[PDB]
Copies of this chain bind each other. A is one copy, B any other.
Amino acid sequence: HHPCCSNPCQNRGECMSTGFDQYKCDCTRTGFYGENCTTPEFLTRIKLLLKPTPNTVHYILTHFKGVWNIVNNIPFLRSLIMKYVLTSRSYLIDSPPTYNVHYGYKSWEAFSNLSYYTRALPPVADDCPTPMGVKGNKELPDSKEVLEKVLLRREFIPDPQGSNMMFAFFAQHFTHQFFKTDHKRGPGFTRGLGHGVDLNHIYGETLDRQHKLRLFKDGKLKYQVIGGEVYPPTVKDTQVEMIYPPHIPENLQFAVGQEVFGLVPGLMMYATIWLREHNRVCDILKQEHPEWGDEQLFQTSRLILIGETIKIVIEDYVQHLSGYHFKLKFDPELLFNQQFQYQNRIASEFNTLYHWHPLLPDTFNIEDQEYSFKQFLYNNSILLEHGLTQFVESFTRQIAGRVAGGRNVPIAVQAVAKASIDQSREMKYQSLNEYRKRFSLKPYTSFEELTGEKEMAAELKALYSDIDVMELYPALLVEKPHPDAIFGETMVELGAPFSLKGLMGNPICSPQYWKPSTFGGEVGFKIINTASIQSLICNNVKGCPFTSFNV
């Protein structure tokens, strides 16, 4: 078998076979040496003695509310802290990207082929004696048994952090610009070739699709007016291909950037809000620049919406998830005297960890109605009937499920949760503990340490035998959550660096783009710098209902 099956190299050292039975570890720039790169260099000793744990940094940020109140009101210090938040997470992600599902070693093919998701850890070799390498049993536990024992929802568990349905649907809408698995090719492949926040879910992935969605007047996107309200145009009008069941009538087949957004009225809500926003920004730009043509109005509006999106994701969305008392800041300038790569490649593990189906409720509560999954799926009538104002009011009110803590996956989507495990295995993911070490965390020594609890730990020990063969995805869903939090430590420590890179990596955050002239001057720049989830809703939804990401 492959000599590297046992994952012998530690601390980011690269394994390489040196014969049928032998390996070598490349220890370059890791700060360690020896056969397995475990012997610390002197300066590394001093850094390991000094640097605080992830769980210490997290306490400070989630406590001392009174001190953060001082810090948040002093611009110099807020900037300084935000700088730290950005740069600490930096060295964790390979940029330029490295491995993918087919390449456990660097190659030009892996670098150059954008159809692949990248990989934070190489896949387990095809010939390894166990699924995880050398440890554990010959087969992993049946995914069905794993799902049923510790993942599936008994009683609904509300998110103690107070996440609402505006948050769950925003998460779904936002992330589906860059998680677009190409099922024709396989789970390690993506159709999101821009690899980040390019708003293709509004504008289309291809220029052909963008042009069918565009009005070609005033920079705008096509739309229709139903009962005085602006909604996306139809499939029959744009000739834009969308995914709908056969029985969905012509008038209810809305056409938007991302082919799947007719699945859920929650997604169509956000699709409508953002289409309105784009056309709203066109109106503003036209006032500032009566001399501009359609193409410049369109392109400039797009850039402004990319900035709004990054702004919102950091300052409302990430802010809410973090539970930090410190006020996060979207300021590209903080990175201007740092080493940082303005480029991104979406990691497969970023997709996997983002399978937050526990967020979904048992029913979808809009006004006085309580819709089942059967009723909610593919029903845009629900949207037209109630209206966007009622959708926002209702979803702002309705609490989401806890993600970590185990047993919170709604039964309606059990097939989807099983697929994340199966697909995880098909893509040959390494173990939870391998991923924890890759992200500077101590491996878990037992299932009890992982769950924080006794009953689930025992199911898992009976299923997996060894903690070092526990899989990443189920673990994220069963993990001991932070105190009163939606997530546990592994989700946060893996998620945040991937997030930082997708957000700050965007070319609009680079010095040559981050100028008022890129956005049509000071007014356009200001739209970016004052954007929020509330203003997005307020500016585009009748009656300006109150909103946020918590109940």
Contact with B along A87-128 (1 / 0, CB 8 A): 000000011101000010111110111000000000000000
Q: Which residue of B lies closest to A299 (CB)?
A: B107
Minimum CB–CB distance from A147 to chain B (whole Å) comes to 35
Q: Among A299, A300, A302, which residue has the most Cβ atoms of chain B within 10 A?
A: A299
Docked CA distance A300–B24 (Å): 16
Docked CA distance A340–B300 (Å): 27
Within 8 A of B (CB), among A511-525: 511-518, 520-521
Q: Among A14, A24, A339, A514, which residue has the most Cβ atoms of chain B within 10 A?
A: A339
By a CB distance below 8 angstroms, the chain B residues around A29 are 511, 515
Contact A296 B105 (CB under 8 A): yes
Q: Which residue of B lies closest to A9 (CB)?
A: B517
| Cβ contact of A18, chosen from B103, B105, B289, B338, cutoff 8 A | B289
Contact A302 B107 (CB under 8 A): yes
The yes or no answer to A86 lying at the interface (CB within 8 A) is no
The yes or no answer to A510 lying at the interface (CB within 8 A) is yes
By a CB distance below 8 angstroms, the chain B residues around A17 are 289, 291-292
Contact A19 B290 (CB under 8 A): yes
A111-B507, A512-B98 in contact; A517/B19 too (CB < 8 A)? no
The yes or no answer to A362 lying at the interface (CB within 8 A) is no
| Cβ contact of A521, chosen from B16, B113, B291, B292, cutoff 8 A | B16
Contact A515 B302 (CB under 8 A): no
The size of the chain A interface, using a CB distance under 8 A, is 58
The yes or no answer to A26 lying at the interface (CB within 8 A) is yes
By a CB distance below 8 angstroms, the chain B residues around A303 are 106-108
Minimum CB–CB distance from A527 to chain B (whole Å) comes to 16
The yes or no answer to A198 lying at the interface (CB within 8 A) is yes
Docked CA distance A95–B340 (Å): 12
Q: Among A16, A112, A507, which residue has the most Cβ atoms of chain B within 10 A?
A: A507
The yes or no answer to A341 lying at the interface (CB within 8 A) is yes
By a CB distance below 8 angstroms, the chain B residues around A342 are 95-96, 341, 343
Contact with B along A179-203 (1 / 0, CB 8 A): 0000000000000001000100000
Docked CA distance A507–B109 (Å): 12
Contact A107 B14 (CB under 8 A): no
By a CB distance below 8 angstroms, the chain B residues around A207 are 109, 113
| Cβ contact of A94, chosen from B106, B337, B512, cutoff 8 A | B512
Contact B289 A515 (CB under 8 A): no
Contact B300 A107 (CB under 8 A): yes
Minimum CB–CB distance from A73 to chain B (whole Å) comes to 27
By a CB distance below 8 angstroms, the chain B residues around A42 are none
Contact with B along A330-348 (1 / 0, CB 8 A): 0000000111111100000
Contact A520 B16 (CB under 8 A): yes
Contact B300 A521 (CB under 8 A): no
Contact with B along A1-39 (1 / 0, CB 8 A): 001000000000011111110001010110000000000
Minimum CB–CB distance from A139 to chain B (whole Å) comes to 26
Contact B106 A513 (CB under 8 A): yes
Q: Which residue of B lies closest to A28 (CB)?
A: B515
Docked CA distance A141–B507 (Å): 40
| Cβ contact of A299, chosen from B94, B105, B339, B340, cutoff 8 A | B105
Within 8 A of B (CB), among A304-335: 306
Contact A109 B299 (CB under 8 A): yes
Q: Which residues of A contact B (CB under 8 A)?
A: 3, 14-20, 24, 26, 28-29, 94-96, 98, 103, 105-109, 111-113, 194, 198, 207, 288-292, 296, 299-300, 302-303, 306, 337-343, 507, 510-518, 520-521
Q: 10 smallest A-B Cβ distances: which pairs?
A: A26-B517, A107-B299, A96-B507, A14-B517, A28-B515, A20-B291, A106-B518, A16-B517, A94-B512, A96-B510
